[PDB]
Copies of this chain bind each other. A is one copy, B any other.
Amino acid sequence: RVKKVREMELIYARAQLELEVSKAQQLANVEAKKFKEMTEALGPGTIRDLAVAGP
């Protein structure tokens, strides 16, 4: 009785893991690509000057 429930929940958890990792995966690809476009929009020296804007 319990082993079938444990086995069934096991394969569900494996696929639920694929749901979780894909959520982390794609939400980070867009997070990284947006950062790619954000920092490319400004410029290498420009972002450095903006971050170190202080005398």
Contact = CB atoms under 8 A, between A and B. Distances in A.
Interface residues of A, number: 49
A-side interface mostly = helix
Copies per complex of this chain: 2
Given A37-B35, A49-B52, A24 B21 contact: no
Interface in A1-26: 2-3, 5-6, 8, 10, 12-26
B48 A45 contact: yes
A24 B27 contact: yes
Contacts of A46: 44-45, 47-48, 51
Interface of A: 2-3, 5-6, 8, 10, 12-28, 30-55
